[PDB]
Amino acid sequence: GRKRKIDRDAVLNMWQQGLGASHISKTMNIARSTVYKVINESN
C-alpha cells in the first residue's frame, strides 16, 4: 500500500520541527545513526 500501514510522520516530525540527532533520538526512540538510515531514505 502507499499511505495505509506505514510510518513516516514520526521521524519526519523530529527533523521538520528543528531538532538534531540527540533530541531527534530522545523524542523519537531511535539511535542518532539509525535516524540517518531513515533521513537518507527520504521516505
Secondary structure, 3-state, the chain? CCCCCCCCHHHHHHHCCCCCHHHHHHCCCCCHHHHHHHHHHCC
Residues in the chain: 43
**CATH number for the domain harbouring residue 2:** 1.10.10.60
Q: Give the determination technique.
A: NMR
Burial class for 5, CB neighbours closer than 10 Å (0-12, 13-18, 19+): exposed
**Number of domains the chain contains:** 1
Domain range for 40: 1-43
Q: Are 27 and 18 in contact (CB under 8 A)?
A: no
Distance, CA of 42 to CA of 8 (rounded, Å): 9
Max CA pair span of the chain = 32
